[PDB]
Design a protein around this ligand. Structure first.
Ligand SMILES: CCOC(=O)[C@@H]1C[C@@H](CC)[C@@H]2C=C[C@H]3CCN(C(=O)[C@@H]4CC[C@H]5C=C[C@]6(CCCN6C(=O)[C@H](Cc6ccccc6Cl)NC(C)=O)C(=O)N54)[C@@H]3C(=O)N12
Ligand SMILES: CCOC(=O)[C@@H]1C[C@@H](CC)[C@@H]2C=C[C@H]3CCN(C(=O)[C@@H]4CC[C@H]5C=C[C@]6(CCCN6C(=O)[C@H](Cc6ccccc6Cl)NC(C)=O)C(=O)N54)[C@@H]3C(=O)N12
Lengths: 109, 109
């Protein structure tokens, strides 16, 4: 597993019942969010760990054809069949780094 | 893995930074919460799955010596080194079933 980017973001999931974003993994705060590339089968995953306690708060696949929505310059989101994920980036530079790597993955899948 | 109880509860985790309970796994709603016994090493785990979509929202160890707090007749809680867990039970009967199995586990560990 090779890291292809690192970006600072608060990782959020959407609680559709209450129509609001909640912190991924249950605790508010910033994470270091990677995209990891597994070269053996050319797969990519988003993996984020809390800066403070290292808890993995997101570990999700990036499937071919994913629609990655850059809602704002610092909040991007996507979904799977079960959850909606959001990254509230610490800076525009972090958002650009992460989006670049994401868009690359989606181009080579 | 043998189930020793099933109880209906909304599984919550405490957000230490934002001082609020958040739904475990990111989505509000009730789960079926088991305690499972692994006889090979006499271990016990709390495992809860959303009723609707089957998401595993809790899968945590029950260590010897755990302090299980029956805060109210329908809200019980405990913690590990990283998180605080809460079960908002659907009824007093559900709370009693779960608490009795938890207390059993803690007696035989
Ligand atoms: C003050 C600070 O607090 C906020 O403002 C809150 C918490 C802030 C972080 C702490 C966060 C930050 C920024 C803003 C940015 C705007 N935004 C929203 O949520 C917008 C508002 C409208 C709302 C409606 C829907 C919602 C959520 C549910 C998913 N979705 C969709 O639109 C999906 C999108 C999609 C499109 C294509 C592909 C994939 C996907 Cl996923 N569409 C569909 C068809 O699936 C969404 O994203 N929505 C954020 C926000 O409010 N907040
Ligand atoms: C009516 C309105 O109810 C609410 O609005 C919310 C949502 C309600 C439904 C989901 C839920 C239900 C019932 C009440 C019951 C009260 N309660 C709280 O959270 C109390 C209030 C004060 C607050 C402060 C701390 C907090 C959380 C963090 C853990 N902890 C501790 O005290 C721990 C406990 C502990 C003791 C021993 C062993 C293990 C552990 Cl874990 N102590 C320590 C030393 O670890 C806690 O439990 N707290 C609930 C609540 O408010 N709500």
């Amino acid at each position: 597993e090779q890291s292809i980017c690192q970006a600072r973001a608060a990782v959020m999931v959407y609680d559709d019942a209450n129509k609001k974003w909640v912190p991924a993994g249950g605790s508010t705060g910033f994470s270091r969010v990677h995209i990891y590339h597994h070269t053996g089968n050319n797969t990519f995953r988003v993996v984020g760990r809390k800066i403070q306690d290292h808890q993995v708060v997101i570990n999700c696949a990036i499937p071919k054809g994913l629609k990655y929505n850059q809602a704002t310059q610092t909040f991007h989101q996507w979904r799977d069949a079960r959850q909606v994920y959001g990254l509230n980036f610490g800076s525009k530079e972090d958002a650009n780094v992460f989006a670049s790597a994401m868009m690359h993955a989606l181009e080579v899948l």
